C-alpha cells in the first residue's frame, strides 16, 4: 500500500489510518527519536507539519511541488491547537507568548 493524498480525519486533520481506507503510515515516537539521533531537523519539521498536520501549509507545499519549487511553509500543527482548546475547556488558561 502507498498513499500520496486522500482522506483526512476530522477532529485532527491528520491523514486516515488503514488499508481499507486510503491512509498513510504512522510515524511513531521511536522514529522521531531516530531522526533526532541524526541532526535531521528539516526532515522532522516537514514530517510533522506539512505532510500531516498544517492544513494551509500542506496545500502551499502541494502547489510548490507541482510548480517545482520544493519549499515548505510549516506554520503550526493543528492538532496542537486542538490540544490547547482541550486544556482551555478546563479551568486552565494556557496561551502562547510573544517574548
Amino acid at each position: 500500500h502507498a498513499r500520496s493524498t486522500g482522506s483526512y480525519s476530522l477532529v485532527t486533520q491528520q491523514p486516515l489510518g488503514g488499508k481499507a481506507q486510503f491512509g498513510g503510515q504512522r510515524f511513531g515516537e521511536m522514529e522521531v527519536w531516530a531522526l533526532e539521533a541524526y541532526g535531521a531537523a528539516y526532515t522532522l519539521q516537514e514530517m510533522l507539519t506539512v505532510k500531516s498536520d498544517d492544513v494551509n501549509g500542506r496545500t502551499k507545499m502541494y502547489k510548490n511541488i507541482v510548480d517545482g519549487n520544493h519549499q515548505m511553509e510549516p506554520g503550526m500543527p493543528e492538532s496542537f491547537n486542538v490540544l490547547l482548546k482541550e486544556i482551555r475547556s478546563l479551568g486552565i488558561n494556557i496561551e502562547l507568548e510573544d517574548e
Partner: peptide, 17 residues
C-alpha cells in the same frame, strides 16, 4: 529541534542578536 541543522539555525539566530 534545537539539534543538528535546527541547532545551526538557532545558533545563527542567537549569534545574530
Amino acid at each position: 529541534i534545537p539539534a543538528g541543522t535546527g541547532y545551526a539555525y538557532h545558533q545563527d539566530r542567537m549569534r545574530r542578536r
